[PDB]
Design an enzyme around this catalytic site. Structure first.
Site, PDB file in Angstrom:
ATOM      1  N   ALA A  77       0.668  -1.622   0.214  1.00 51.72           N
ATOM      2  CA  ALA A  77       0.151   0.218  -0.419  1.00 51.72           C
ATOM      3  C   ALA A  77       0.582   1.156  -0.037  1.00 51.72           C
ATOM      4  CB  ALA A  77      -1.148   0.068   1.213  1.00 51.72           C
TER       5      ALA A  77
ATOM      6  N   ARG B 286       4.938   9.303 -11.675  1.00 50.33           N
ATOM      7  CA  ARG B 286       4.045   9.413 -12.699  1.00 50.33           C
ATOM      8  C   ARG B 286       4.634  10.720 -12.669  1.00 50.33           C
ATOM      9  NH1 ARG B 286       0.085  10.116  -8.971  1.00 50.33           N
ATOM     10  NH2 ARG B 286      -0.482   8.148  -9.426  1.00 50.33           N
TER      11      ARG B 286
ATOM     12  N   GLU C  90       8.183  -6.810  -4.388  1.00 50.40           N
ATOM     13  CA  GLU C  90       7.522  -7.358  -3.075  1.00 50.40           C
ATOM     14  C   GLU C  90       7.456  -9.169  -3.265  1.00 50.40           C
ATOM     15  OE1 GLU C  90       4.879  -7.009  -1.110  1.00 50.40           O
ATOM     16  OE2 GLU C  90       4.693  -9.009  -1.018  1.00 50.40           O
TER      17      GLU C  90
ATOM     18  N   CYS D 134      -8.423  -4.536   3.721  1.00 54.68           N
ATOM     19  CA  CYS D 134      -9.270  -3.668   4.085  1.00 54.68           C
ATOM     20  C   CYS D 134     -10.464  -4.573   3.663  1.00 54.68           C
ATOM     21  CB  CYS D 134      -9.143  -2.462   3.845  1.00 54.68           C
ATOM     22  SG  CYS D 134      -8.249  -1.225   3.651  1.00 54.68           S
TER      23      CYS D 134
ATOM     24  N   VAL E  74      13.560  -9.049  -0.528  1.00 55.24           N
ATOM     25  CA  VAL E  74      14.994  -8.697  -0.725  1.00 55.24           C
ATOM     26  C   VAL E  74      15.974  -8.783   0.978  1.00 55.24           C
ATOM     27  CG1 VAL E  74      13.611  -6.292  -1.499  1.00 55.24           C
ATOM     28  CG2 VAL E  74      15.919  -6.398   0.513  1.00 55.24           C
TER      29      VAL E  74
HETATM   30  C1  FAD Z   1      -8.060  -8.123   7.467  1.00 57.86           C
HETATM   31  C2  FAD Z   1      -7.901  -6.555   8.130  1.00 57.86           C
HETATM   32  C3  FAD Z   1      -9.017  -5.156   7.680  1.00 57.86           C
HETATM   33  C4  FAD Z   1      -8.255  -4.432   7.353  1.00 57.86           C
HETATM   34  N1  FAD Z   1      -8.931  -3.714   7.561  1.00 57.86           N
HETATM   35  C5  FAD Z   1      -8.888  -1.924   7.354  1.00 57.86           C
HETATM   36  C6  FAD Z   1     -10.284  -0.457   7.156  1.00 57.86           C
HETATM   37  O1  FAD Z   1     -11.318  -0.442   7.132  1.00 57.86           O
HETATM   38  N2  FAD Z   1      -9.740   0.685   7.227  1.00 57.86           N
HETATM   39  C7  FAD Z   1      -8.390   1.020   7.571  1.00 57.86           C
HETATM   40  O2  FAD Z   1      -7.447   2.449   6.973  1.00 57.86           O
HETATM   41  N3  FAD Z   1      -7.327   0.332   7.321  1.00 57.86           N
HETATM   42  C8  FAD Z   1      -7.593  -1.510   7.269  1.00 57.86           C
HETATM   43  N4  FAD Z   1      -6.808  -2.521   6.920  1.00 57.86           N
HETATM   44  C9  FAD Z   1      -4.929  -2.121   7.481  1.00 57.86           C
HETATM   45  C10 FAD Z   1      -4.096  -2.688   5.637  1.00 57.86           C
HETATM   46  O3  FAD Z   1      -3.816  -4.214   5.781  1.00 57.86           O
HETATM   47  C11 FAD Z   1      -2.911  -1.649   6.066  1.00 57.86           C
HETATM   48  O4  FAD Z   1      -3.087  -1.189   7.201  1.00 57.86           O
HETATM   49  C12 FAD Z   1      -2.354  -0.875   4.713  1.00 57.86           C
HETATM   50  O5  FAD Z   1      -2.677  -1.921   3.507  1.00 57.86           O
HETATM   51  C13 FAD Z   1      -1.064  -0.577   4.811  1.00 57.86           C
HETATM   52  O6  FAD Z   1       0.108  -1.733   4.289  1.00 57.86           O
HETATM   53  P1  FAD Z   1       1.831  -1.039   3.558  1.00 57.86           P
HETATM   54  O7  FAD Z   1       1.761  -0.758   2.682  1.00 57.86           O
HETATM   55  O8  FAD Z   1       3.145  -0.553   4.835  1.00 57.86           O
HETATM   56  O9  FAD Z   1       1.965  -2.596   3.733  1.00 57.86           O
HETATM   57  P2  FAD Z   1       0.893  -4.297   4.568  1.00 57.86           P
HETATM   58  O10 FAD Z   1      -0.157  -4.028   3.870  1.00 57.86           O
HETATM   59  O11 FAD Z   1       1.736  -4.549   5.840  1.00 57.86           O
HETATM   60  O12 FAD Z   1       2.506  -5.216   3.127  1.00 57.86           O
HETATM   61  C14 FAD Z   1       3.418  -4.623   2.719  1.00 57.86           C
HETATM   62  C15 FAD Z   1       3.846  -5.833   1.921  1.00 57.86           C
HETATM   63  O13 FAD Z   1       5.240  -6.913   1.552  1.00 57.86           O
HETATM   64  C16 FAD Z   1       6.290  -7.565   1.907  1.00 57.86           C
HETATM   65  N5  FAD Z   1       7.688  -7.665   2.079  1.00 57.86           N
HETATM   66  C17 FAD Z   1       7.922  -7.175   3.875  1.00 57.86           C
HETATM   67  N6  FAD Z   1       8.942  -7.578   3.880  1.00 57.86           N
HETATM   68  C18 FAD Z   1      10.312  -7.777   3.077  1.00 57.86           C
HETATM   69  C19 FAD Z   1      11.382  -7.675   2.088  1.00 57.86           C
HETATM   70  N7  FAD Z   1      11.846  -8.408   3.288  1.00 57.86           N
HETATM   71  N8  FAD Z   1      11.546  -7.881   0.811  1.00 57.86           N
HETATM   72  C20 FAD Z   1      10.162  -8.156   0.186  1.00 57.86           C
HETATM   73  N9  FAD Z   1       9.104  -7.902   0.571  1.00 57.86           N
HETATM   74  C21 FAD Z   1       8.431  -7.309   1.429  1.00 57.86           C
HETATM   75  C22 FAD Z   1       5.228  -7.864   2.746  1.00 57.86           C
HETATM   76  O14 FAD Z   1       5.220  -9.513   2.890  1.00 57.86           O
HETATM   77  C23 FAD Z   1       3.667  -7.302   2.267  1.00 57.86           C
HETATM   78  O15 FAD Z   1       2.909  -8.588   2.273  1.00 57.86           O
HETATM   79  C24 FAD Z   1      -7.038  -3.668   6.836  1.00 57.86           C
HETATM   80  C25 FAD Z   1      -5.689  -4.860   7.332  1.00 57.86           C
HETATM   81  C26 FAD Z   1      -6.288  -6.254   7.616  1.00 57.86           C
HETATM   82  C27 FAD Z   1      -5.282  -7.248   7.233  1.00 57.86           C
HETATM   83  S1  COA Z   2      -6.247  -2.007   3.198  1.00 61.18           S
HETATM   84  C1  COA Z   2      -5.500  -0.108   2.251  1.00 61.18           C
HETATM   85  C2  COA Z   2      -6.310   0.541   0.871  1.00 61.18           C
HETATM   86  N1  COA Z   2      -4.484   0.215   0.637  1.00 61.18           N
HETATM   87  C3  COA Z   2      -4.640  -0.150  -1.002  1.00 61.18           C
HETATM   88  O1  COA Z   2      -5.358   1.162  -1.792  1.00 61.18           O
HETATM   89  C4  COA Z   2      -3.872  -0.865  -2.056  1.00 61.18           C
HETATM   90  C5  COA Z   2      -3.833  -0.416  -2.664  1.00 61.18           C
HETATM   91  N2  COA Z   2      -4.105   1.177  -3.127  1.00 61.18           N
HETATM   92  C6  COA Z   2      -2.824   1.277  -4.003  1.00 61.18           C
HETATM   93  O2  COA Z   2      -1.964   0.030  -4.767  1.00 61.18           O
HETATM   94  C7  COA Z   2      -2.099   2.529  -4.231  1.00 61.18           C
HETATM   95  O3  COA Z   2      -3.630   3.178  -3.824  1.00 61.18           O
HETATM   96  C8  COA Z   2      -1.845   2.735  -5.905  1.00 61.18           C
HETATM   97  C9  COA Z   2      -3.228   2.621  -6.742  1.00 61.18           C
HETATM   98  C10 COA Z   2      -0.953   2.570  -6.348  1.00 61.18           C
HETATM   99  C11 COA Z   2      -1.146   3.868  -6.265  1.00 61.18           C
HETATM  100  O4  COA Z   2      -2.549   4.954  -7.145  1.00 61.18           O
HETATM  101  P1  COA Z   2      -1.978   6.184  -7.896  1.00 61.18           P
HETATM  102  O5  COA Z   2      -1.266   6.329  -7.115  1.00 61.18           O
HETATM  103  O6  COA Z   2      -1.103   5.661  -9.686  1.00 61.18           O
HETATM  104  O7  COA Z   2      -3.696   6.993  -7.901  1.00 61.18           O
HETATM  105  P2  COA Z   2      -4.773   6.592  -8.694  1.00 61.18           P
HETATM  106  O8  COA Z   2      -5.185   6.255  -9.622  1.00 61.18           O
HETATM  107  O9  COA Z   2      -5.796   6.932  -7.484  1.00 61.18           O
HETATM  108  O10 COA Z   2      -4.926   8.898  -8.349  1.00 61.18           O
HETATM  109  C12 COA Z   2      -4.011   9.773  -8.516  1.00 61.18           C
HETATM  110  C13 COA Z   2      -4.230  10.463  -9.051  1.00 61.18           C
HETATM  111  O11 COA Z   2      -5.835  10.490  -9.809  1.00 61.18           O
HETATM  112  C14 COA Z   2      -6.699  11.784  -8.717  1.00 61.18           C
HETATM  113  N3  COA Z   2      -7.770  11.192  -9.274  1.00 61.18           N
HETATM  114  C15 COA Z   2      -8.269  10.086  -8.400  1.00 61.18           C
HETATM  115  N4  COA Z   2      -9.680   9.797  -7.787  1.00 61.18           N
HETATM  116  C16 COA Z   2      -9.815  10.523  -9.275  1.00 61.18           C
HETATM  117  C17 COA Z   2     -11.581  11.120  -8.891  1.00 61.18           C
HETATM  118  N5  COA Z   2     -12.533  10.010  -8.430  1.00 61.18           N
HETATM  119  N6  COA Z   2     -11.612  12.237  -9.595  1.00 61.18           N
HETATM  120  C18 COA Z   2     -11.074  12.636 -10.035  1.00 61.18           C
HETATM  121  N7  COA Z   2      -9.359  12.304  -9.798  1.00 61.18           N
HETATM  122  C19 COA Z   2      -8.980  11.868  -9.045  1.00 61.18           C
HETATM  123  C20 COA Z   2      -5.756  12.058  -7.427  1.00 61.18           C
HETATM  124  O12 COA Z   2      -6.278  12.935  -7.376  1.00 61.18           O
HETATM  125  C21 COA Z   2      -4.500  11.729  -7.780  1.00 61.18           C
HETATM  126  O13 COA Z   2      -3.859  13.390  -8.589  1.00 61.18           O
HETATM  127  P3  COA Z   2      -2.747  13.199  -8.185  1.00 61.18           P
HETATM  128  O14 COA Z   2      -2.100  13.748 -10.168  1.00 61.18           O
HETATM  129  O15 COA Z   2      -2.236  12.705  -7.982  1.00 61.18           O
HETATM  130  O16 COA Z   2      -2.232  14.768  -7.846  1.00 61.18           O
END
Ligand code: FAD
Ligand code: COA
Ligand code: FAD
Ligand code: COA
Lengths: 443, 443
Positions: A12, A23, A34, A44, A81
């Protein structure tokens, strides 16, 4: 310039850093490593896939390594890594594919390795139907187990965990919740935990509180759970008991940890070593109410970390300015939102703190359908300063919590909250907003 | 002391005053004179009774004259105060019961006479199936007409009006909306009016725009509506074209009007005469963005007036510190919330203002059921200062509007909004809240 940015972790924080950097500056070479074989997915959402509401698991990924590729970003799953030759002096990056291992260099290094489950010491954890809910693979495991009921025990009545409870009930299992502290959602004041006990109970969940788990019974299979309070029979058990940051690699290369144990950072996501950033759950954030660093492993904070590091590397101006602690989750028919500090926490920090807790509606008394809505304010005795707050509603919003987060952000008093011109209309709010009523204003 | 508080008008402003004063100082003699024969009811609810969703009209009242009596408050419906012998020098208050007329005195006078419909000069308005939506009796009249269809014309595409269109469709009628200006909700920027035109259309409502109504055809019955654009046949017609304050009795007593036409007031709800307050729809309020007096006839502001006046009188310390204009209404499947200034109004006022308008969702892309969500930000070019904004959702709520209202309250920039730690979770918001996306941040 046009140099090389290596992201360790791609969930994330890591995917955010990568996506924004490339970008903002297409000259960079952007590579993501990863270990998990998936990348850029909403952990989530896992309970909604568990529950059956979301049909297939792949629904949860935001960007495929293929779409990444199209966008200048080279992502490698199933690559771990294993070492960094930092400072020291980069190469660094030895890491491992399918077969082989090899070298890489970086110019900018983003550590985004996340967090792993924090496992309690309990004999029998190693068995066959004990599970954890963190990753896509975790989801696969579980998703295989689930159909084929029958009895679930969940350790830990934190948000995920309450979330799992609903998923398992939606899948027909009987579910008992075990918690060592006295309430569900033990980290918040007790009124909220109460509300939750009653809702869990209404939906058939059994909630054992103040319970020491002694072992998981079985011959490598798991069928029980033996506790201080008796024996819970269970063919599936979910450990929901915390996460801890993945800091191990970053210590190996001498990156500094903060008091929380998470990697330390500045408003630029930069660590103590030149060229090394951290983002997401492996990283501390500045808490704005506490006036210090804090671990807040939420997914929106990971995206804001990641995006700041990204921008900073691409040579844009970007600062991350801290958190106030706002969370929301869904447990059955409650939406539960917290922010800032709970009264207990406020007290533990030394404030002379008071709390108010009120119950209003979500719409006019007369409006068809209008539900209950609770709001809790935690404030400083003399000053009026806001310190935290909860709102609970059935509402898909409320989420009213956002207003409190806003106020907490500057100093923001109960007085300030009273002065706010909020939105009225019978379908949405009584004529006094429940935030206003809670302000000073009834007890 | 223990003196006599007299409230002229007993709908919202008036009722709040009376109820707060009596509670805050029970030594007061509190008497309410209402002309309308109902007291303390929610006009805002009227469309939901119209529509059938709320079964009986009485379900809208909050306190009966009886319950008031139990609480030390004497209310008289069907009592018109006809003259005040002010300063001058109080007897004042000659007013009229059933049969009689008579005298009273006051020590404190709260003027809460409200606002009346503002009728365009249109030949044939005086006829039989022309209606207005303002009072409990208006509600009676319409509730009688409704069952018995068949064709409705609504003049004016303001919030009540859009609210009415929904009610009428739910009641089987065909409905055409007639608006003089080019958009529904002409008072706000046009993006929003557009989303509404589409929703109205999608529900069977015909919406004539830029339309000059020439007269109401019939022989004292109404069956038409002749307009610059043709002829709309209609056996029921709703006038929904504005309100104006009831300032007539107050002018008679030499109470000062503000530039808006409403009664002027201070932070204490005090008028220019000693002993005389105003509360609710008859009263101006200080707009905090425009830094001057403004008319904002909404029921939440009436309660805020009312409760300030009330408190002040019972000798509590209380101040009303303005509004920012926040409003929300429900039209069909849209909830539409605005606050501050629209870009138009921003520019009329002379700001170098720009706007951004974006469309997001209300919940993760992958979450079941997540709907659209739009957000508008209106800001100052250089400073980044927020000036107003809108959010539309299906959502019960969002309502996110309150965050903006919050910020608008202090100065509050686009930067500040950006820094906010709002609440993320898949059911309620995408991982970037739509407020955050809007902020600087895409166009
Ligand atoms: C069931 C569940 C529900 C959730 N619901 C919510 C919610 O409602 N709202 C909210 O805001 N948040 C929620 N979260 C939180 C969410 O998981 C994280 O807070 C968010 O995805 C941030 O992730 P991050 O990129 O720091 O790392 P993480 O998502 O912990 O992932 C990092 C990844 O990088 C990898 N990595 C680790 N070590 C190494 C290495 N040595 N070499 C290479 N790669 C490696 C790992 O294997 C891992 O999969 C939820 C989480 C879970 C599990
Ligand atoms: S468990 C917590 C949730 N975890 C995760 O989200 C895991 C997956 N998400 C990701 O991996 C990252 O969030 C990714 C998608 C890799 C990052 O995506 P980008 O950084 O490319 O973001 P987006 O494609 O969402 O777009 C970023 C730019 O797009 C503009 N923008 C988004 N959405 C809209 C809408 N609905 N209408 C107009 N514009 C929109 C954002 O403003 C952003 O703009 P910048 O060009 O970055 O300023
Ligand atoms: C259809 C509809 C929908 C609405 N929806 C919303 C919404 O969604 N949100 C929102 O915030 N607001 C809404 N409102 C607004 C609401 O009507 C008012 O803004 C609010 O009730 C403020 O009232 P007030 O006490 O100042 O006076 P009013 O409600 O105008 O009433 C004062 C009363 O005092 C009486 N009076 C007048 N003159 C005299 C005299 N000389 N002697 C004795 N008695 C007198 C009048 O007969 C009158 O009924 C809506 C209104 C309508 C009509
Ligand atoms: S169209 C716009 C809407 N129009 C109307 O509201 C018309 C009808 N309303 C009225 O007439 C006035 O609003 C009335 C109902 C006469 C005023 O009532 P009160 O002023 O007596 O107010 P309440 O009875 O609502 O109570 C006020 C005190 O009670 C505390 N309180 C309210 N709600 C709660 C909940 N849910 N939980 C705990 N406490 C609650 C309020 O804080 C308030 O406290 P005080 O500080 O003691 O006044």
């Amino acid at each position: 310039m046009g140099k090389r940015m290596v992201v360790v972790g791609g969930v994330a924080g890591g995917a955010s850093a990568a996506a924004k950097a490339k970008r903002e500056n297409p000259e960079l070479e952007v590579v993501v490593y990863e270990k998990s074989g998936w990348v850029s997915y909403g952990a989530c959402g896992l309970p909604y896939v568990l529950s059956g509401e979301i049909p297939r698991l792949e629904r949860l990924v935001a960007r495929t390594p293929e779409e990444f590729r199209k966008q200048g970003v080279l992502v490698h799953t199933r690559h771990e890594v294993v070492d960094v030759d930092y400072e020291l002096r980069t190469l660094t990056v030895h890491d491992h594919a399918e077969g082989r291992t090899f070298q890489d260099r970086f110019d900018h290094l983003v550590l985004a390795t996340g967090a792993r489950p924090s496992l309690p010491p309990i004999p029998g954890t190693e068995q066959e139907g004990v599970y954890t809910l963190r990753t896509m693979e975790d989801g696969e495991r579980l998703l295989k187990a689930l159909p084929q009921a029958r009895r679930a025990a969940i350790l830990g009545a934190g948000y995920i965990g309450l979330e799992a409870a609903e998923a398992f009930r939606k899948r027909g299992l009987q579910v008992t919740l075990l918690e060592a502290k006295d309430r569900p959602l033990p980290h918040w004041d007790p009124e909220v935990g109460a509300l939750l006990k009653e809702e869990l109970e209404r939906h058939g969940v059994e909630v054992w509180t103040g319970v020491k788990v002694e072992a998981f019974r079985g011959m490598g299979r798991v069928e029980a759970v033996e506790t201080s309070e008796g024996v819970v029979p269970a063919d599936l058990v979910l450990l929901a008991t915390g996460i801890r940051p993945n800091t191990e690699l970053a210590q190996a290369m001498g990156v500094a940890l903060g008091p929380t144990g998470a990697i330390a950072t500045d408003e630029r996501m930069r660590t103590n070593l030149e060229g090394v950033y951290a983002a997401g759950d492996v990283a501390e954030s500045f808490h704005r109410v506490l006036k210090r660093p804090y671990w807040l492993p939420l997914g929106d904070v990971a995206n804001k970390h990641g995006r700041t590091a990204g921008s900073v590397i691409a040579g844009r101006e970007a600062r991350f300015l801290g958190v106030v602690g706002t969370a929301i989750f869904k447990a059955f028919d409650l939406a539960v939102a917290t922010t800032g500090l709970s009264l207990e926490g406020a007290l533990k920090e030394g404030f002379w703190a008071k709390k108010v807790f009120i119950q209003s509606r979500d719409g006019a008394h007369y409006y068809p359908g209008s539900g209950p809505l609770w709001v809790e304010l935690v404030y400083e005795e003399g000053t009026g300063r806001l310190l935290g707050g909860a709102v609970v509603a059935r509402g898909h919003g409320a989420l009213r919590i956002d207003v409190l987060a806003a106020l907490l952000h500057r100093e923001g008093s109960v007085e300030d909250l009273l002065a706010l011109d909020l939105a009225y209309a019978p379908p949405f709010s009584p004529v006094w907003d429940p935030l206003l009523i809670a302000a000073q204003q009834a007890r």
